[PDB]
Design a protein around this ligand. Structure first.
Ligand SMILES: Cn1cc(Cc2cccs2)c(-c2cc(Cl)nc(N)n2)n1
Ligand SMILES: [Cl-]
Ligand SMILES: [Cl-]
Length: 462
């Protein structure tokens, strides 16, 4: 069976949530369901990202990083997919996975997901990044109600999952230390407590899994097989040994037209074999523009959707003018964030810095006027970042990785309500100093040395 069609290669960059969705053209589109989420990231990774920018790697740092990273990430992806999960998105060394099911099956599927988690940790026992640098992961799990949101224009689509279960899994994963599996309180409340031995987590209602102790007659393989009854797209029969049903997609112009809107043009070029398959693995100077839109705690997903759509329509028009791209969109704790980037796949202009600032101020001014958006915050950082397609052959995404990505991310959270930029952006800009304000230096998680940070005040006093 031939399976290397363009539609199949495109679907590798998307979850089943999208590939097998059958929703309208309206934007925003919103749908609601229940499921279990897994958030996982890798330990000792940014330690490696720094090593690979070193002259040691003789101009093949990006190639070596993507290789070792995909060696480990693809093993996680295989485990998730074998256990029936849907990988929603990748970001650097992290990924979010979904087991969507009806409420009645949540209990049994949580047990499936915990077993998956423990087998993921089993991969990284007796394993190291380097001589003397261990590789481990941290897993948070949550369960409950989940809302999906799709937004975009006629040519581009983006999607998110939203709600307390999403917020819950983010929080659970941040408590997790190396080798931990942390369950949200609602997950613990819904799970088969007859079978999961947990321990308290100080000052928190979330719990840590210690052991899966099933009854004496329990057989996991038979239990799992029964659970697959509720998995619409689990590969089966003649396709028993495929990792994804998406692998079997056949040409369908209408379907491909909708799927390609989720994928960046330079990726599509590679899918069409009009660009070398290694072009996108690179250590590249870029400017990161990390936009955060904050809503109110009581805001419902059905008011949030229209506001993200309106904001997105202006964000994409500004980025088009200033020649930037949306690399990722995320949401948790009532904040929807856009990871925008200037200067990757051939999108290199000399005034990159002035255009990133002016573009940021434009996005700020417009989004501050959108009805339900309570606060806008934008962090701008410039420097060398890793770019590449991360994941497994059958499920992967283009992603950017680096200190400057993390810095822009922390700037928009620690300096809310304004536009901030780093020292590289400030000095390199073709703008005078009174357009800026030098800021207080705040200690920020995961950023050892900020360097001087500035607010982009604007051209006027007012
Ligand atoms: C790798 N990655 C990281 C994130 C942030 C989150 C991590 C835990 C909850 S959210 C996402 C994501 C994906 C989708 Cl589809 N929706 C939303 N809200 N976040 N993916
Ligand atoms: Cl098809
Ligand atoms: Cl870096």
């Amino acid at each position: 069976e031939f399976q290397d069609w363009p539609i199949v290669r495109i679907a590798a960059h998307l979850p089943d949530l999208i590939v097998y969705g059958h929703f309208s053209p309206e934007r925003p589109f919103m749908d609601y369901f229940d499921g279990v989420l897994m958030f996982v990231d890798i330990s000792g990774f940014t330690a490696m990202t720094e090593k690979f920018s070193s002259a040691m790697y003789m101009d093949r740092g990006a190639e070596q990083l993507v290789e070792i990273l995909n060696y480990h990430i693809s093993a996680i992806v295989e485990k998730v997919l074998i256990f029936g999960g849907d990988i929603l998105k990748f970001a650097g060394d992290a990924l979010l996975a979904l087991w969507r099911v009806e409420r009645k099956q949540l209990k049994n599927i949580i047990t499936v997901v915990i077993k998956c988690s423990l087998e993921i940790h089993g991969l990284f026992e007796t394993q190291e990044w380097e001589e003397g640098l261990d590789i481990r992961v941290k897993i948070g799990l949550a369960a409950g109600h989940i809302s999906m949101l799709v937004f975009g224009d006629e040519t581009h689509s983006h999607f998110l999952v939203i709600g307390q279960a999403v917020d819950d899994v983010r929080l659970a994963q941040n408590m997790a230390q190396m080798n931990d599996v942390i369950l949200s309180p609602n997950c613990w409340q819904l799970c088969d407590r007859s079978m999961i031995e947990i321990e308290s987590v100080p000052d928190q209602r979330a719990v840590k899994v210690n052991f899966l102790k099933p009854p004496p007659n329990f057989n996991f393989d038979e239990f799992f097989t029964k659970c697959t009854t509720f998995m619409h797209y689990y590969p089966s029969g003649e396709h028993k040994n495929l990792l994804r049903l998406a692998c079997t997609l056949k040409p369908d112009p209408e379907l491909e037209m909708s799927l390609q809107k989720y994928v960046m043009e330079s990726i599509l070029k590679q899918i069409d074999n009009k660009q070398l398959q290694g072009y996108l693995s690179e250590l590249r100077p870029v400017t990161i523009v990390f936009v955060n839109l904050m809503f109110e705690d009581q805001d419902k997903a059905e008011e949030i959707g229209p506001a993200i759509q309106d904001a997105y329509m202006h964000i994409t028009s500004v980025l088009k003018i200033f020649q930037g791209q949306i690399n990722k969109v995320f949401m948790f704790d009532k904040g929807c964030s856009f990871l925008c980037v200037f200067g990757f796949p051939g999108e290199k202009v000399p005034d990159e810095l002035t255009h990133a600032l002016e573009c940021a101020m434009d996005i700020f001014d417009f989004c501050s006027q959108v009805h339900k958006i309570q606060t806008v915050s934008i962090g701008v950082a410039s420097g060398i970042v890793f770019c590449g397609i991360v994941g497994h052959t059958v499920r992967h995404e283009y992603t950017v990785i680096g200190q400057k990505v993390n810095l822009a991310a922390r700037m928009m959270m620690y300096y809310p309500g304004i536009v901030t930029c780093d020292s590289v952006t400030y000095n390199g800009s073709n703008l005078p100093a009174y357009f800026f304000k030098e800021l207080p230096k705040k200690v920020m998680k995961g950023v050892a040395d900020s360097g001087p940070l500035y607010q982009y005040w604007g051209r006027t006093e007012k």
